[PDB]
Amino acid sequence: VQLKGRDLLTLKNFTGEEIKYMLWLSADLKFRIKQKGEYLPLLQGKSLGMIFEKRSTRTRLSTETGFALLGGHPCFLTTQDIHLGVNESLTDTARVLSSMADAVLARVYKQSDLETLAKEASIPVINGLSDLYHPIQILADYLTLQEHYSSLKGLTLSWIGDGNNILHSIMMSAAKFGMHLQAATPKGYEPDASVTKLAEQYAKENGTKLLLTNDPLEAAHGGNVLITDTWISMGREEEKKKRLQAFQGYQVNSKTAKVAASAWTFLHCLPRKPEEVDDDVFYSPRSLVFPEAENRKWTIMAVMVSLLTDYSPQLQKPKF
Amino acid sequence: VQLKGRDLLTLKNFTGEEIKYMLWLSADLKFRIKQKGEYLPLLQGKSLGMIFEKRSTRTRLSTETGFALLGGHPCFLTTQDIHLGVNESLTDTARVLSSMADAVLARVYKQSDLETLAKEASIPVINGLSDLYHPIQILADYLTLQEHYSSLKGLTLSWIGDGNNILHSIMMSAAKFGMHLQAATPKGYEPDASVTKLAEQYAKENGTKLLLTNDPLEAAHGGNVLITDTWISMGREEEKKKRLQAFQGYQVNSKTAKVAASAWTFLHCLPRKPEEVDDDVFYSPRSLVFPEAENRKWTIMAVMVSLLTDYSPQLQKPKF
Amino acid sequence: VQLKGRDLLTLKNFTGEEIKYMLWLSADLKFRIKQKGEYLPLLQGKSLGMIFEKRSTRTRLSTETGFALLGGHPCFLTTQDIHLGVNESLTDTARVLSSMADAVLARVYKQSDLETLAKEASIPVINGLSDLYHPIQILADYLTLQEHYSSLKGLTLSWIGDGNNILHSIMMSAAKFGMHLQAATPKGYEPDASVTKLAEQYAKENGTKLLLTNDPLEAAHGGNVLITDTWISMGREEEKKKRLQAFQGYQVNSKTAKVAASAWTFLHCLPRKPEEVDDDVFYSPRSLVFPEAENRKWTIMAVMVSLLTDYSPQLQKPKF
Ligand SMILES: CCC[C@H](N)C(=O)O
Ligand SMILES: CCC[C@H](N)C(=O)O
Ligand SMILES: CCC[C@H](N)C(=O)O
Numbered sequence: 009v010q011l012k013g014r015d016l017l018t019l020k021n022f023t024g025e026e027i028k029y030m031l032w033l034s035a036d037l038k039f040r041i042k043q044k045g046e047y048l049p050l051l052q053g054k055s056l057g058m059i060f061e062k063r064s065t066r067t068r069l070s071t072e073t074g075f076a077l078l079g080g081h082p083c084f085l086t087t088q089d090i091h092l093g094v095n096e097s098l099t100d101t102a103r104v105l106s107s108m109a110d111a112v113l114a115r116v117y118k119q120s121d122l123e124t125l126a127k128e129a130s131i132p133v134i135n136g137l138s139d140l141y142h143p144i145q146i147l148a149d150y151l152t153l154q155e156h157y158s159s160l161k162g163l164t165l166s167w168i169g170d171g172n173n174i175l176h177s178i179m180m181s182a183a184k185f186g187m188h189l190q191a192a193t194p195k196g197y198e199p200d201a202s203v204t205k206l207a208e209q210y211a212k213e214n215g216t217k218l219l220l221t222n223d224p225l226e227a228a229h230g231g232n233v234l235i236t237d238t239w240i241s242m243g244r245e246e247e248k249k250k251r252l253q254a255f256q257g258y259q260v261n262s263k264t265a266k267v268a269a270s271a272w273t274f275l276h277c278l279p280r281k282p283e284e285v286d287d288d289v290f291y292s293p294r295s296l297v298f299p300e301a302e303n304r305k306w307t308i309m310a311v312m313v314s315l316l317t318d319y320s321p322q323l324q325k326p327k328f
Numbered sequence: 329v330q331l332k333g334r335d336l337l338t339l340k341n342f343t344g345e346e347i348k349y350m351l352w353l354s355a356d357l358k359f360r361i362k363q364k365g366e367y368l369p370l371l372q373g374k375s376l377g378m379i380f381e382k383r384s385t386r387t388r389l390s391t392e393t394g395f396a397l398l399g400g401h402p403c404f405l406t407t408q409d410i411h412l413g414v415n416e417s418l419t420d421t422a423r424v425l426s427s428m429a430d431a432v433l434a435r436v437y438k439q440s441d442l443e444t445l446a447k448e449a450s451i452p453v454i455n456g457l458s459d460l461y462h463p464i465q466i467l468a469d470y471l472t473l474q475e476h477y478s479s480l481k482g483l484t485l486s487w488i489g490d491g492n493n494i495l496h497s498i499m500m501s502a503a504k505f506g507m508h509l510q511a512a513t514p515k516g517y518e519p520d521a522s523v524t525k526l527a528e529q530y531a532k533e534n535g536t537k538l539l540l541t542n543d544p545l546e547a548a549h550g551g552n553v554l555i556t557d558t559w560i561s562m563g564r565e566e567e568k569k570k571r572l573q574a575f576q577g578y579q580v581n582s583k584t585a586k587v588a589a590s591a592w593t594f595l596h597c598l599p600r601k602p603e604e605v606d607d608d609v610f611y612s613p614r615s616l617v618f619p620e621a622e623n624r625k626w627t628i629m630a631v632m633v634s635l636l637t638d639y640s641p642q643l644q645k646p647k648f
Numbered sequence: 649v650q651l652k653g654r655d656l657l658t659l660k661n662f663t664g665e666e667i668k669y670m671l672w673l674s675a676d677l678k679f680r681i682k683q684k685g686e687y688l689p690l691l692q693g694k695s696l697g698m699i700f701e702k703r704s705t706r707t708r709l710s711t712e713t714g715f716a717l718l719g720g721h722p723c724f725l726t727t728q729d730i731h732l733g734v735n736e737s738l739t740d741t742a743r744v745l746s747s748m749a750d751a752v753l754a755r756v757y758k759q760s761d762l763e764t765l766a767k768e769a770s771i772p773v774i775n776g777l778s779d780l781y782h783p784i785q786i787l788a789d790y791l792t793l794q795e796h797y798s799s800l801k802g803l804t805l806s807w808i809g810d811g812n813n814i815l816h817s818i819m820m821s822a823a824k825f826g827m828h829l830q831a832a833t834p835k836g837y838e839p840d841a842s843v844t845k846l847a848e849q850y851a852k853e854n855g856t857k858l859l860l861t862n863d864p865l866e867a868a869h870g871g872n873v874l875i876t877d878t879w880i881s882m883g884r885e886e887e888k889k890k891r892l893q894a895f896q897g898y899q900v901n902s903k904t905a906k907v908a909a910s911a912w913t914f915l916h917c918l919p920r921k922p923e924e925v926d927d928d929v930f931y932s933p934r935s936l937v938f939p940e941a942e943n944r945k946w947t948i949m950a951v952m953v954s955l956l957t958d959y960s961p962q963l964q965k966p967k968f
Contacts, residue, residue, distance in 0.1 A: 041373075047372050047373040048373075052687050053681075053687040053688075053717060055713045055716060055717065057709075063408065065405070065408035065409075066408075066424065069377075069403060069405065069424070069428045069429075070428060072401075072403055073375045073401065073403055073428050073429065076375060076401035076403075077373060077375065077401070081712075081713065081716035081717070083709060083712055083713055083716075085705070085709065088703065088705035088706075089705075095919060095920070096919050096920050100920070103938055103941075104706065104709070104941060107938070107941065107942040107945070108709045108710060108713050108945065109709075109713065279415060279416050280415070280416050280420070298423055298427070301423075301424060301427065302427040305427070305428065361693075367692050367693040368693075383728065385725070385728035385729075386728075386744065389697075389723060389725065389744070389748045389749075390748060392721075392723055393695045393721065393723055393748050393749065396695060396721035396723075397693060397695065397721070599735060599736050600735070600736050600740070618743055618747070621743075621744060621747065622747040625747070625748065
C-alpha cells in the first residue's frame with residue numbers, strides 16, 4: 009500500500025501484496041511509457057547512488073537508463089568507498105550518500121554490508137545484488153511470467169541449479185504470490201536450511217506447495233516455468249575443476265522441458281553459459297530469457313518510483 | 329525525407345538529399361538552440377548506448393553533451409562487451425542494447441562488427457568511428473563548410489594525406505553534395521579501389537569532378553577547401569620509423585595554401601600533429617579547425633534527432 | 649550583484665558582498681528545493697565539464713548530483729587531457745571545452761594551470777580544488793556556519809593545522825564577511841607571507857581582527873568556530889615519518905574546545921584522520937562536520953546558477 013521510504017534488501021520482509029504492487033507499477037510504467045509512449049518525469053529532481061562492488065554492467069545499464077527515463081539522475085560510483093580501498097567506516101559513508109543521493113542501489117558481496125549500510129542511512133537502500141539475494145531480478149522474472157501467463161495465480165516454478173541468492177529470493181517470494189516451488193540442488197549445495205525452513209513456512213500460510221530434492225528431472229516435473237542458473241559463479245577453480253562435475257547431471261535441456269508441463273516456459277538471469285543449458289532450450293520461443301532481461305528495467309523503475317514517490321498506478325492492477 | 333529508425337553506418341547508402349537534411353537539422357538545432365537559446369527536449373525520455381572500443385573522449389564529450397542537451401540520456405559503456413573481454417556473442421549483446429538504449433553510437437575497430445551489430449538489433453546503430461569510415465565527422469566538416477561559404481554547391485575539396493576512413497567518407501559524400509574531390513595519397517596508401525571506383529561513380533551521376541594522385545600540390549591546386557589528416561594513426565612503429573618518411577613530402581603548409589584557390593580554407597579532424605601541418609596553416613584564420621570540432625556536436629544531435637524523432641526543422645533549409 | 653560569466657578561481661578577487669550573494673543563493677536553493685521541495689530546472693540545457701586531476705569522488709558526487717538536480721548535465725572527464733598523458737597544449741583543450749561544456753569545474757594540482765585554463769577559455773572556470781585554494785569548500789563552511797549562528801557578523805574563526813589551500817581560502821574570505829581569523833600553524837608551515845600579508849590587508853579595511861601563531865590553544869582561544877584539517881595530505885612519507893611529529897602538539901580535542909568560546913563549534917572538510925582530532929570533538933553535536941559536507945552541494949549549485957544564469961534569489965537574503 010505504502011512503500012515510499014521503505015528500503016528493499018530482500019523480499020523476505022515484504023507482503024506478497026506489496027511485491028505485487030511493485031510488479032503492478034512496473035507494468036504500469038512499461039505500458040504507460042513503452043506502449044503508450046508518454047514521458048514520465050516521476051523521478052525528476054532525484055538522484056540515485058549506485059554502488060558497484062564488482063563491475064556489473066548489465067544491471068547498471070538497466071538501472072541507469074531506467075532511473076534516467078523517469079527523469080531521475082543516476083550517479084555511478086565504483087570503489088570510491090568501502091568496496092576496494094576505503095579509509096572511512098561505511099557507517100559514515102552512508103551519511104554522505106544520505107545527503108547526496110536520495111536513494112542507493114548497491115551491489116555488494118555481503119548482505120551484512122547492506123543492513124548496516126541501510127540502518128546507518130536516512131536513505132532507502134536497494135539490494136542491487138548480494139551474495140544472499142537478488143530481489144529486483146526475480147522481481148522482473150515474476151513480472152515477465154505474469155505477462156506471459158497473465159497470472160502467477162498458482163503456477164509451479166522449477167528450480168534446477170546450485171542454491172544461490174536467486175533461488176533464495178524466489179523462495180522468499182514465490183509463495184507470497186501463491187506459486188509452487190520445486191527446488192533441485194546437488195547434495196552438496198542445498199541452500200542453508202535457515203531460509204528453506206522459512207520458505208516452507210511461507211508456503212504453509214499461503215497454501216502453496218514446496219519441496220526440494222537433488223534430482224532435477226523431479227523438480228522440473230510438473231513445472232510450469234522451470235528456472236535454472238549457472239553453478240559456476242567463478243567462485244574458485246579447484247571448486248569446479250572436478251567439484252562441479254559432481255554437480256554434473258543437471259544441464260537443463262529439452263529432455264527436461266519434456267517432463268515439464270505443457271504451459272512450460274524457461275527462465276535464466278543471464279549470461280549464457282552452455283554448462284547448464286543448451287541452445288535448444290535457451291533459444292526455444294518458450295524461454296523468456298530476453299524479456300526477463302528487459303523487465304529488469306521496468307521493475308527497477310517501479311521499485312524506485314515505489315520508494316521515492318507518492319505516484320499511484322494509473323491502469324487497473326494486473327491479475328496476479 | 330524520413331530517417332527515423334534508419335541506422336547510420338556510412339554516407340554510402342545515403343541520398344545527398346538525406347545528408348543535406350541532416351546538416352539542415354544540425355543547422356536548425358545549432359541556431360534554434362545556440363543562437364536563439366531555447367531549450368529543446370527533443371530527446372526527452374530517450375537513451376543512447378555509446379560503445380567505445382578505444383578511449384575516444386572528444387567524440388563522447390560532444391555526443392554525451394549533445395544527446396543530453398536535447399534532454400536525452402547518454403549511457404557510457406566501455407569494454408563491458410565484445411571490445412576487450414566479452415564472454416557472449418555480440419549477436420545477443422545487441423538484444424540487450426535493443427532493450428536498454430533506443431539507439432547506439434558505437435566506435436569500433438571494424439566495420440564488420442558494426443553491420444552485424446546493426447543487423448542484429450531493433451535499434452539504429454551509429455558509426456561513432458570505424459576503421460573504414462567516419463560519417464558524423466565529415467558530416468560536421470560539411471556543415472562547417474556550408475556555414476563558411478553558405479553553399480557546398482560546387483566547391484572542390486582537396487585531400488592531402490593517407491587514405492583512411494575520413495577520406496573515404498568524404499568520397500562517399502562529397503559528390504552527393506555536388507562538390508569536387510581532389511585526393512592525393514602516397515603511392516603506398518591509395519584507398520582500396522573498391523571505394524574510389526564508387527566515388528568516381530557518384531561523381532558521374534552528379535556531374536562532379538574527381539581525380540586523385542600521389543602529388544599533393546596537385547590535389548590542392550584549385551582547391552577551395554583543402555583537407556588533411558595525420559598519416560601516423562599510431563598503427564605501428566616500424567610502419568613509420570622509416571615507412572612514413574616515404575610518406576614525406578606532404579606536410580601541408582601555406583606553400584600549399586598558395587596553390588590553393590582564393591576562397592581557400594582548411595580542415596582537419598584533430599588532434600594537432602605537427603607532422604602533417606605547421607601552425608602557419610592550422611592556425612590561419614582560414615582554417616576552420618575548431619568550428620569543425622564544435623559542429624561535431626550539432627551534427628550528432630541532428631543525427632539522433634534524425635533517427636529518434638519525427639521532429640521537423642523549423643527555419644528555412646540552408647542553401648547547399 | 650552580477651556574477652554570470654564570472655569564473656571562480658578563488659575568493660581573493662571577490663567582494664564579500666559577492667560571496668555573500670552566493671551563500672544567499674545557496675540558501676535560497678537549499679530551501680526552495682530541499683525544504684519546499686520544488687523542482688528547479690535552472691540548469692536545464694547546460695553542461696558542466698568537470699576535470700579531475702586526481703580521483704576526488706566526494707566533490708564530484710556533490711557537484712554531479714547538484715548540477716543535475718538543477719536540470720543540468722554534468723560531464724565527467726578524468727585524464728583524457730593534460731592531467732596524465734595529454735598530447736595537446738591545454739591552451740587548445742580549453743577551446744574544445746569552451747565549445748562543449750558551457751562551464752568547467754576543474755580540480756587540479758596547480759593554480760597555474762587554472763588561470764591559463766581560464767584565460768584561454770570563453771567559459772567560466774571553477775576551482776574544484778587547487779594546491780593553493782579551495783573556495784567552494786569554505787563557501788559551504790561559511791554557509792554552514794551562517795546557518796548555525798544565523799550570522800557570520802563577527803564571529804572569530806580558529807585555525808589549527810598546517811597552512812594549506814583551505815586556510816588560505818578562509819583568509820581570502822573570512823574578513824570580507826567581517827569574521828575574525830585566528831590562525832595557528834607549526835613554525836614550519838606558516839602560509840607563504842604572500843597571502844597572509846593580504847589577509848591582514850583585508851582585515852584592516854573591514855575592521856576584522858587577525859593574528860597567527862604556532863601555539864594552537866592560543867588561536868583556539870576565544871574561538872567561536874574552530875577549524876582544523878589533516879596535516880598529512882599524503883604529500884610524502886619521509887615528510888611525516890618524523891617530520892610531522894615536529895607537527896605534534898596540535899591534535900584538536902575537547903581540551904581545545906574548553907578554551908574555545910561558548911558558542912563554540914567545529915569544522916573540518918573531511919575525511920576523518922584521527923591524527924588531528926579525536927572522536928570526542930569530531931562527533932560532538934557541536935561539530936558541523938557533516939552539515940558542512942552536505943552544503944558543498946547547495947553552494948556549488950548556487951555557484952553554477954550564479955555564473956550560468958540570470959536567476960535571482962526568491963526569499964529574503966539571510967542575515968550575514
Ligand atoms: C530532493 C533531494 C533531497 C536530498 N536530501 C538531496 O541530497 O538533495
Ligand atoms: C521509449 C524507450 C523504449 C525503449 N525500448 C527502452 O529501452 O525503454
Ligand atoms: C547553450 C549551450 C551553448 C554552448 N556553447 C554549447 O557548447 O552548447
